[PDB]
Design a protein around this nucleic acid. Sequence first.
DNA 1: CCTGTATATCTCTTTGACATATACATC
DNA 2: GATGTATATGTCAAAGAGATATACAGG
Lengths: 68, 68, 68, 68, 132, 132, 132, 132
Amino acid sequence: MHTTLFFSNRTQAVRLPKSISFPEDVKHVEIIAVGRSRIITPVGESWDSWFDGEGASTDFMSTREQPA
Amino acid sequence: MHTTLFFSNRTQAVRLPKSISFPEDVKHVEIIAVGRSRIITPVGESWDSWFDGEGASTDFMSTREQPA
Amino acid sequence: MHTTLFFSNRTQAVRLPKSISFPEDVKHVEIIAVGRSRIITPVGESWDSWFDGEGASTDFMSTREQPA
Amino acid sequence: MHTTLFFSNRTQAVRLPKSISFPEDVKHVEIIAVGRSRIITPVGESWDSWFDGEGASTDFMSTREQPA
Amino acid sequence: MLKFMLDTNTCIFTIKNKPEHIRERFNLNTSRMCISSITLMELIYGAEKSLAPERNLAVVEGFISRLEVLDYDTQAAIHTGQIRAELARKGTPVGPYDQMIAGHAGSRGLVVVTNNLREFERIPGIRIEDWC
Amino acid sequence: MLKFMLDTNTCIFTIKNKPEHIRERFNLNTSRMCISSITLMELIYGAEKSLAPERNLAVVEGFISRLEVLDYDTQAAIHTGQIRAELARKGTPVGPYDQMIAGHAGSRGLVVVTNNLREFERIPGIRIEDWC
Amino acid sequence: MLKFMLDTNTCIFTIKNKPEHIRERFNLNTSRMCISSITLMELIYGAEKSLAPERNLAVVEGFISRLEVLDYDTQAAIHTGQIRAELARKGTPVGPYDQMIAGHAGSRGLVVVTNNLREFERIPGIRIEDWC
Amino acid sequence: MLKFMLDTNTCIFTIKNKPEHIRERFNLNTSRMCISSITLMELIYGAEKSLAPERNLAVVEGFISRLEVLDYDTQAAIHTGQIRAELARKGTPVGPYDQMIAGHAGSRGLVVVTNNLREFERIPGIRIEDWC
DNA sequence: CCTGTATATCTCTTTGACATATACATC
DNA sequence: GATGTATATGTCAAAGAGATATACAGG
């Protein structure tokens, strides 16, 4: 989709299109900057978007080459 | 991190904290739903759009003339 | 000499021993860091320590060698 | 930078701006007078002091390794 | 208010298996979890040396992103140089990377969350938990 | 304003011998020298396992008190974790602490000043200098 | 997040020849890559001295918009003025813009992605990768 | 409130000669004067390549620390590469550092203060002074 | 009209900077 | 009572964060 950003009284916000608005009225959200991206998330589900994203390669860390 | 939802004339909105607020008044961003999450990015993302684009620049920088 | 630093409710300050306190024609001041030091000058005079102090070397940048 | 002068009950003082403050631990400094200015430094100043202070033990780190 | 320093072993194990019992844990304890910057280097090493450095640096980088990465500071280096020596004064061996994580959590009051418990016990004054 | 980063070897040598060709630079390049918190973690270990742990501790705390000790932070970890993978691509092994030194000193543009010039040779895109 | 700093010569080539493997690399390392503002200057120049500057000034905006363009700050200067003295000693300088794009990367440990390997290998403490 | 950005010739001269009128002017214009980092690079180069590198870097430090080092950022890039081009149309060539200064001072509406004024005049739309 | 697009305002609470209190501490 | 030390509160303003209001699109 495509939305806008905007300033309030010294606060930078995004305008949420009515289609993808958050279910329920609701309370507060979490946010994280990945890259030049921002993920928004309801409280208690911050890690979901990472578990359900792409996984690491089978070869990833077979070995953990620590010394002794 | 934490932030908060709010209404701006019946339109719903999220407050970007200044920690991870966006640099310019880059006014246009691309929103999406991942699961119950939302991922927000500036508009000039895909590197293909620039590869599938203009600018033959046949004369352009036949030389760069740096003063070595 | 020797003196203490201390906190005045939320500002970290140094005490000025009476011997080397600031004269009556000096009533608020400038301050500048050079390394692990801080220099405290009265207004209008921050360069006075720098002009009077360490000089450059004689050979120092006779030439400049900008790549013409 | 600009800072201020003030009286702590009798003693004259200056407030360090927070950007160029010293670590909260550090309590003791060396004040000295150059022309009409003052200099402030922490107390473990000279590399002369440490060479002329003490000595290591004879055996101290006659070995050092982990898995090279 | 952080409580939990995830070790490298947990990190690695979660990256490979993305288990469900970890995923509810990660959701409850979201604002109390970190890793030492010592771990991060390992994660980074492991991705670069892998057969997919770009794919695995992204997965790390979203894994990194959702928690705090603590700098191995001085208090951490004093506390591991003390935990490392009395470890030799007793002859029990633990890895140069594993000492640093144990020590860094130790230097700040955090419990190490590991799945190599047996190798973390012999470490003086440590707190330990397993989330796998 | 920071220019040099003493390898652990250097600090040991200087602590033990207190040379005069060492005192040379220290006075000149004062307020340009520092050590990675890693190097501190090694020094503390060595004083702590030493037969005069309070004299040997006491000299160190004066040693590092006249330097700055830089925290192994997130850029230092990424950088080490890249150059560690390069050393694997090309078989050159370097000890785990000195490359953490390496990966720290690199990430900030500093010259690691060591005396082990013979395997500080190889670590990609390094800047050694030999005060001994 | 960043690893690669794209040299001018590399960028010029990608503009003129717009290859396919580069597009592949580009798509792997999005958000890993960057340019110095030294370079961004040099591009703007060429577009402007060309025929049809509106055409090219346009095409670069899409190029640099899809990158990060890193400012040439204090540390980047300092690290560059140092590397500029070392090649004075060697008697072998490099181009003045090349000396700056070097030390910029070098003050943050990035790898210069250029294609004039032979000229950039003599820069001290450099890492190089070549994509053309 | 910055209004002045001194040139390399300006700064070099002040250091070698520390005249008196220049010290009065410096004292009156404080916080209204700055330098481009591009001049900072030339200044630590000159100190390094000198026959007294640590003394000279300690005068340069006392110099930057009393005034400002504006980053040569992206807005400063465009300005340089524009006037870099229009000088090619007009066939008069200007130094690269002197032209990267110039493109910085204009991008932030600033007065170039220099002493090679006849050199700089060819630069379209730059406001200059002398203080020597 | 309804999303959106803007604007205004009003609370709060924090925090850095600016001031006045003496607890007294001793020598 | 000159000289240092500590902490106890004061106001004052800017700023990040919230909290509402209520303008005008333009399909």
